[PDB]
Design a protein around this motif. Structure first.
Motif, PDB file in Angstrom:
ATOM      1  N   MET C   1       1.146   8.887   6.755  1.00  7.85           N
ATOM      2  CA  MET C   1       0.958   7.511   6.106  1.00  7.85           C
ATOM      3  C   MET C   1       0.820   7.096   4.639  1.00  7.85           C
ATOM      4  N   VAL C   2       1.984   7.195   3.932  1.00  8.67           N
ATOM      5  CA  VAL C   2       2.040   7.131   2.494  1.00  8.67           C
ATOM      6  C   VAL C   2       1.557   5.716   2.039  1.00  8.67           C
ATOM      7  N   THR C   3       2.049   4.863   2.947  1.00 13.33           N
ATOM      8  CA  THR C   3       1.537   3.422   2.667  1.00 13.33           C
ATOM      9  C   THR C   3       0.265   3.131   2.531  1.00 13.33           C
ATOM     10  N   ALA C   4      -0.607   3.723   3.553  1.00 14.73           N
ATOM     11  CA  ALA C   4      -1.996   3.759   3.543  1.00 14.73           C
ATOM     12  C   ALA C   4      -2.606   4.302   2.451  1.00 14.73           C
ATOM     13  N   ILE C   5      -2.049   5.350   1.805  1.00 22.71           N
ATOM     14  CA  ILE C   5      -2.370   6.074   0.440  1.00 22.71           C
ATOM     15  C   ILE C   5      -2.203   5.121  -0.582  1.00 22.71           C
ATOM     16  N   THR C   6      -0.904   4.189  -0.458  1.00 24.94           N
ATOM     17  CA  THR C   6      -0.666   3.433  -1.575  1.00 24.94           C
ATOM     18  C   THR C   6      -1.723   2.247  -1.598  1.00 24.94           C
ATOM     19  N   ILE C   7      -1.940   1.794  -0.420  1.00 24.14           N
ATOM     20  CA  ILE C   7      -2.954   0.537  -0.111  1.00 24.14           C
ATOM     21  C   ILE C   7      -4.407   1.011  -0.857  1.00 24.14           C
ATOM     22  N   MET C   8      -4.715   2.196  -0.516  1.00 20.98           N
ATOM     23  CA  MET C   8      -5.949   2.737  -1.105  1.00 20.98           C
ATOM     24  C   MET C   8      -6.072   2.813  -2.548  1.00 20.98           C
ATOM     25  N   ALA C   9      -4.930   3.266  -3.166  1.00 23.70           N
ATOM     26  CA  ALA C   9      -4.718   3.492  -4.736  1.00 23.70           C
ATOM     27  C   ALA C   9      -4.725   1.871  -5.248  1.00 23.70           C
ATOM     28  N   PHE C  59     -15.538  -0.158  -0.778  1.00 21.56           N
ATOM     29  CA  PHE C  59     -16.219   0.261   0.404  1.00 21.56           C
ATOM     30  C   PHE C  59     -15.222  -0.015   1.482  1.00 21.56           C
ATOM     31  N   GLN C  60     -14.498  -1.228   1.396  1.00 13.30           N
ATOM     32  CA  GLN C  60     -13.571  -1.385   2.181  1.00 13.30           C
ATOM     33  C   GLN C  60     -12.204  -0.632   2.325  1.00 13.30           C
ATOM     34  N   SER C  61     -11.790  -0.093   1.087  1.00 18.04           N
ATOM     35  CA  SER C  61     -10.848   1.023   1.072  1.00 18.04           C
ATOM     36  C   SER C  61     -11.171   2.269   1.576  1.00 18.04           C
ATOM     37  N   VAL C  62     -12.350   2.652   1.619  1.00 20.33           N
ATOM     38  CA  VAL C  62     -12.945   3.800   2.390  1.00 20.33           C
ATOM     39  C   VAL C  62     -12.897   3.689   3.791  1.00 20.33           C
ATOM     40  N   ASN C  63     -13.370   2.224   4.249  1.00 21.50           N
ATOM     41  CA  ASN C  63     -13.312   1.757   5.515  1.00 21.50           C
ATOM     42  C   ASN C  63     -11.867   1.949   6.343  1.00 21.50           C
ATOM     43  N   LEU C  65      -9.573   3.796   4.885  1.00 20.95           N
ATOM     44  CA  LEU C  65      -9.102   5.116   4.860  1.00 20.95           C
ATOM     45  C   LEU C  65      -9.310   6.069   6.215  1.00 20.95           C
ATOM     46  N   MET C  66     -10.784   5.800   6.400  1.00 20.92           N
ATOM     47  CA  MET C  66     -11.157   6.580   7.541  1.00 20.92           C
ATOM     48  C   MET C  66     -11.033   5.867   8.810  1.00 20.92           C
TER      49      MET C  66
END
Ligand SMILES: CCC(=O)N(CCCCCNC(=N)N)C1CCN(CCc2ccccc2)CC1
Lengths: 53, 232, 284, 217, 336
Positions: C1-9, C59-63, C65-66
């Motif tokens: 899930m590279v797009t998920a990591i990009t969203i988190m970044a 907080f939403q980012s880690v939500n 991500l997990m």
């Protein structure tokens, strides 16, 4: 043109002043500064016990 | 200046009556005003107080809630509204001027007072010498004994001395235990520490004999003393 | 899930930029200028609201991500409530600043009466109250429900879910997009129309250059607001009216829209404070 | 802790709110410094607006309260009290158009305008400039050429041309032409249009000050 | 009209007479003693009630109350210990350049561009501050007022003259006309039998309140003198000026002892005061900060940087416990 006579008489009255030598007056000022330096709450900061501010 | 009285007269107990004190001769809107009453068989007692601008109101516990004090600054008149009176409220109500700032002299002027009659944590002070006879010229000492340390943190012992001439409103003699009031002759003097106070009069004369009262101002409710009486 | 990591970044970098800019603005305001005028009061309030809003972002980012909320019921409630609260405070502070400048330019003799620092403080507190009027029902409604394997935070309590959720969406759309856009657009348009006629801003090369710079700044502010707040509301409405199957494209679009929404919070310090001519003079 | 000082603090807060109210009432006012040369038309414009060191004139026009400070009554060095008037909204400078051939006096007014138009304190205080005595200008141009005062004046000896030349010469004296305005008006004695011009200029200055406060300007 | 030559001759004679007495500079005598070192002073209190720029202030003789005059048309009296405001007097004219607080504490004085020294009566019945008298007669703006007692007051106006008033009668009893420029300052000796006035002709003078004659004239500046203050000994004073130079004169030697200047300082001086013992020399500048000069070594000893505008006024209490500096920032800090 009475201001001329006014100025010259005032200068004549100001000329007859018994000057004190500069060393004596400087020593007197220094002596006054040294003698009263204990009662100078600005020179030596007194502790907050007798500091009303 | 001048403070007058209005609203006395005999009253059936359990009723209501309003006392009005209209001030003419000073900036009434800048002075806090107190009401002080004096029972026929007793001494002065505090009743109520309003600050300047009506921002703070206090009452004695014996009249708290039953009474209501209010002022009309534009009309220069001070109102005390009493509801559900009782037989213990028969007294003569004085109207006292008071201004509070650094170096002020509160309680300086006392109104003439009205004589309403009703048909049918408190610092206590004692004045052991209830009365004493003397002659003019004698130096006389009057002592007041408090029950709490009146010496506040800022070094100001809040204690006032009043004099009540026969059939007259009391007048301020000494404010904060050491400072003389405006117009009081320099023969009066006050001293002492917390819980131990003394009023000294030198070369006493006539027209100075009356009842000497001792008040605190450390915290409300304000409490007076029994009142040492001088006589010739 | 590279797009998920990009969203988190993207979420993390937006939060970092917003926090840095907002905090620097508050620093400059509290030390140098020291909130001596109404405009600085409003700028400080806006920066504070934006910083609080963007502190919610990781907080939403880690939500995401997990895939679940680990922070518990109290933290869920407070995070959601301060998110909505800060959104509303920022929007209402923008509207208040627009109305303030409109009154300052179009009704100057009465802006003498109104535009005092005490009135600025009163209006600020009132706006925080009107924002609390919707920040409180999150305390009254938010709850961390549990799924078969997932744990999510929702804002639906009463049985009429179709009525209540749609009412919340319509209320936020109307009192956060339509009314604010109308009010700031009308105020700034009328202000610019009036400024086209001021003698100090017409009659020479440099005076007309100054007027042109002012109208450019106003247009930039309005356009930034529109661009950063329209996609998210449009997407919310479309999703509320369309089945919109949950594929990767929907999630990427939603997170892009959320990042755009917080971009307003990150850019407001630059537009309103770093281009505030008082700040320019203090910085030059 | 604050035994009797509670009432002192209450009095302090009451007089503090009185100070704040008086400060707001004074901020509602708009102030206008008044200047000019000797025996200029300043008294004339004072009489137009109906309302012993300085004389303050208060008048109201269209729900706006103006205060006017006539200071020319102080025979002292201007450099020492001129910083008291920093922050005045505008300056009302009076120049007599009939004093171009009297004693030179026009050059005195020009040098005063130059000296207090580029001042360190009034670097952004916009000047409202009046030019009284148009009728005497009409009377005197027909017989006294403007070359008496301005020897380089190459133009017709008509009232409009000379008046425009004088206005341009006065408005040429602000070095920072991109910072402060110089509003000009030839004082007319009808319908109280002078106070209307003052009102318009003051409204423009208020708008500019509001823009500077808001940060747009 | 040859008497100008005689005036020049007496000027040269005075220069030679006060040049002969110059045995050694005060710096040469004082170089042997230890310096006072860096002095930290912090804003113990800040008094924030003025909405316009402050042009004056003055401490009471009890060293607790102070009166401050600003351009907003107010004359506030602060209780410095607890920051409370004791009075807030609305002024007749909002153009005020000075104020004075009487030694007994009963009266306050205030003047400015209106050429009138209007004195106010504090300690009175009726609980309000009432204008006791309006002293008129100056033809120029007043720059400083100082109370000799509750009875008399000396003003210094911009008409190049200082005057002594009788408050009860309201009429001048003595006038001092020897200056050639605006008299921008004034300072009473501790015994109040003689005072000094600093003019814009770059020359202070030593007046006699009893007679009304300038005893001595102290030249040596290059620009207007904005401030002046007697040494606590009463035999010397220091003058501030627009040329960023403060220098300490001496009445007995009739010369200038040293000068307090620094190359990094180009901003003029708006106020000068002395510490209680006279060792320090506070001096306000247009550079928004004060400088604690060592009055005997000419070195600095600290900086009082807490203001956002010119410190127009500055005053040390009579007990030396604090320094109050009021600025055009409209805040009046109190250092210690
Ligand atoms: C219609 C807009 C909308 O739905 N939201 C606001 C968009 C955020 C932009 C804020 N910009 C600013 N304050 N300047 C919601 C988006 C979703 N969040 C969810 C809050 C949440 C969700 C899960 C876990 C923790 C917090 C609420 C605002």
């Amino acid at each position: 043109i009475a201001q001329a006579r006014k100025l010259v008489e005032q200068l004549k009255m100001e000329a007859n002043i018994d000057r004190i030598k500069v060393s004596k007056a400087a020593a007197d000022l220094m002596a006054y500064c040294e003698a009263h330096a204990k009662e100078d709450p600005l020179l030596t900061p007194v502790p907050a016990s007798e500091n009303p501010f | 200046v001048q403070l007058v009285e209005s609203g006395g007269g005999l009253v059936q107990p359990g009723g209501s009556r309003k006392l009005s004190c209209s001030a003419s001769g000073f900036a009434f809107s800048s002075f806090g005003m107190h009401w002080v009453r004096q029972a026929p068989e007793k001494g002065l007692e505090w009743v109520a107080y309003i600050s300047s601008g009506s921002g703070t109101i206090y009452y004695a516990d014996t009249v708290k809630g039953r009474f209501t004090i209010s002022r009309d600054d534009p009309k220069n008149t001070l109102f005390l509204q009493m509801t559900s009176l009782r037989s213990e409220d028969t007294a003569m109500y004085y109207c006292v001027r008071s201004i509070y700032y650094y170096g002020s002299s509160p309680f300086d002027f006392w109104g003439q007072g009205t004589t309403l009659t009703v048909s049918s944590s408190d610092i206590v002070m004692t004045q052991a010498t209830s009365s004493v006879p003397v002659t003019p010229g004698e130096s006389v000492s009057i002592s007041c004994r408090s029950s709490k340390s009146l010496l506040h943190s800022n070094g100001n012992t809040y204690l006032y001395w009043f004099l009540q001439r026969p059939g007259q409103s009391p007048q301020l003699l000494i404010y904060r235990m050491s400072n003389l009031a405006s117009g009081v002759p320099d023969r009066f003097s006050g001293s002492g520490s917390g819980t131990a106070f003394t009023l000294t009069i030198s070369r006493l004369e006539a027209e100075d004999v009356g009842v000497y009262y001792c008040m605190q101002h450390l915290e409300y409710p304000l409490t007076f003393g029994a009142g040492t009486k001088l006589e010739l | 899930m590279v797009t998920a990591i990009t969203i988190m970044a993207l979420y993390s970098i937006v939060c970092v930029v917003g926090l840095f800019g907002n905090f620097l603005v508050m620093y400059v305001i509290v030390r140098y200028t020291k909130m001596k005028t109404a405009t600085n009061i409003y700028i400080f309030n806006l920066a504070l609201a934006d910083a609080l809003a963007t502190s919610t972002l990781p907080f939403q980012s880690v939500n995401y991500l997990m895939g679940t909320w680990p922070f518990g019921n109290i933290l869920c409630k407070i995070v959601i409530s301060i998110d909505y609260y800060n959104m509303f405070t920022s929007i209402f502070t923008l509207c208040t600043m627009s109305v303030d400048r409109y009154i300052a330019v179009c009704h100057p003799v009465k802006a003498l009466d109104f535009r005092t620092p005490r009135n600025a403080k009163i209006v600020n507190v009132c706006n925080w109250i009107l924002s609390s009027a919707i920040g409180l029902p999150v305390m009254f409604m938010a709850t961390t429900k549990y799924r078969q394997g997932s744990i999510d935070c929702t804002l639906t309590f009463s049985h009429p879910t179709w009525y209540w959720e749609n009412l919340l969406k319509i209320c936020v759309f109307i009192f956060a997009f339509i009314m604010p856009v109308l009010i700031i657009t009308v105020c700034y348009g009328l202000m610019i129309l009036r400024l086209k006629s001021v003698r100090m801003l017409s009659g020479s090369k440099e005076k007309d250059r100054n007027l042109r710079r002012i109208t450019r700044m106003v247009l930039v502010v309005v356009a930034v607001f529109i661009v950063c707040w329209t996609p998210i509301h449009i997407y919310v409405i479309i999703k509320a009216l369309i089945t919109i199957p949950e594929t990767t494209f929907q999630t990427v679009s939603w997170h892009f829209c959320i990042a755009l929404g917080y971009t307003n919070s990150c850019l407001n310090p630059v537009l309103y404070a770093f281009l505030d001519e008082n700040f320019k003079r203090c910085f030059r | 802790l604050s035994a009797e000082d509670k009432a002192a603090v209450e009095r302090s807060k009451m007089i503090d709110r009185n100070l704040r109210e008086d400060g707001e009432k004074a901020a509602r006012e708009v102030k206008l410094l008044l200047l000019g040369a000797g025996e200029s038309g300043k008294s004339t414009i004072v009489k137009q607006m109906k309302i012993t060191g300085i004389v303050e004139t208060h008048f109201t026009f269209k729900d706006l309260h103006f205060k006017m400070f006539d200071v020319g009554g102080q025979r002292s060095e201007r450099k020492k009290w001129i910083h008291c008037f920093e922050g005045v909204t505008a300056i009302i400078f009076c120049v007599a158009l009939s004093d171009y051939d009297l004693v030179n006096r026009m050059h005195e007014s020009m040098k005063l305008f130059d000296s207090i138009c580029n001042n360190k304190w009034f670097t952004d205080t916009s000047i409202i400039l009046f030019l009284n005595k148009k009728d005497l200008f009409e009377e005197k141009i027909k017989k006294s050429p403007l070359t008496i005062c301005y020897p380089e004046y190459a133009g017709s000896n008509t009232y409009e041309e000379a008046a425009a030349y004088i206005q341009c010469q006065f408005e040429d004296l602000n070095k920072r032409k991109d910072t402060k305005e110089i509003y000009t008006h030839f004082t007319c004695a009808t319908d109280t249009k002078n106070v209307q011009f003052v009102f318009d200029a003051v409204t423009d200055v208020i708008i500019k000050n509001n823009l500077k406060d808001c940060g747009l300007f | 009209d040859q008497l100008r030559q005689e005036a020049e001759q007496l000027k040269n004679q005075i220069r030679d007479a006060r040049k002969a007495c110059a045995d050694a500079t005060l710096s040469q005598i004082t170089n042997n003693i230890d310096p006072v070192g860096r002095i930290q002073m912090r804003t113990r209190r800040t008094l924030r009630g003025h909405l316009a720029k402050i042009y004056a202030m003055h401490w009471g003789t009890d060293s607790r109350l102070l009166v401050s005059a600003s351009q907003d048309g107010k004359l506030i009296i602060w209780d410095s210990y607890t920051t409370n405001k004791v009075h807030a007097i609305p002024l007749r004219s909002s153009w005020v350049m000075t104020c004075a607080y009487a030694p007994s504490g009963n009266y306050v004085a205030c003047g400015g561009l209106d050429n009138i020294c209007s004195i106010y009566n504090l300690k009175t019945r009726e609980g309000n501050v009432r204008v006791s008298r309006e002293l008129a007669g100056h033809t120029g703006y007043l720059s400083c007022c100082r109370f000799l007692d509750d009875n008399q007051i000396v003003t210094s106006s911009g008409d190049t003259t200082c005057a002594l008033w009788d408050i009860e009668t309201g009429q001048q009893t003595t006038t001092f006309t020897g200056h050639t420029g605006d008299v921008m300052s004034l300072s009473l000796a501790p015994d109040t039998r003689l005072f000094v006035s600093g003019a814009c002709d770059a020359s202070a003078k030593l007046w006699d309140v009893r007679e009304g004659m300038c005893r001595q004239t102290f030249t040596g500046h290059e620009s207007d003198i904005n401030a002046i203050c007697f040494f606590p000994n009463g035999n010397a004073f220091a003058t501030g000026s627009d040329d960023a130079t403060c220098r300490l004169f001496d009445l007995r030697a009739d010369q200038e002892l040293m000068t307090y200047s620094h190359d990094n300082i180009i901003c003029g001086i708006t106020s000068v005061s002395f510490s209680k013992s006279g060792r320090l020399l506070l001096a306000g500048y247009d550079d928004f900060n004060c400088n604690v000069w060592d009055a005997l070594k000419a070195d600095r000893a600290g900086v009082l940087a807490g203001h956002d505008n010119r410190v127009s006024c500055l005053g040390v209490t009579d007990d030396g416990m604090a320094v109050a500096t009021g600025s055009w920032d409209s805040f009046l800090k109190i250092w210690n």
